[PDB]
Symmetry: C3
Subunit: 41 residues, 3 copies
């Protein structure tokens, strides 16, 4: 059972990392969209 | 407790999937707003 | 080991929650941008 938890924790860590990289990319795109909107005003 | 840790990991797996759902929703709303800015 | 696994689970739990707070942050900036763009049309 211990080894099964270790493997699922590793799976959760990879998904957690993937979500973190997606957050950073969405943050970049949002900041680019903010600048375009401000330039259009 | 092995069972206890197993239930915590199932909890985190659920929060993970929920976060993944929120990311997809935020991505779709960003694409719609970006298209609205392009149309202007 | 069971305590070592409880800690990694605790690591991940902290990150998940940080991720939630970043999602809420981005949702809010997106909602303010949506309003801003609505005022430009």
């Amino acid at each position: 059972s211990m080894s099964g938890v270790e493997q699922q924790v590793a799976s959760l860590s990879g998904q957690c990392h993937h979500h973190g990289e997606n957050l950073r990319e969405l943050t970049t795109l949002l900041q680019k969209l903010q600048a375009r909107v401000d330039q259009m005003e």
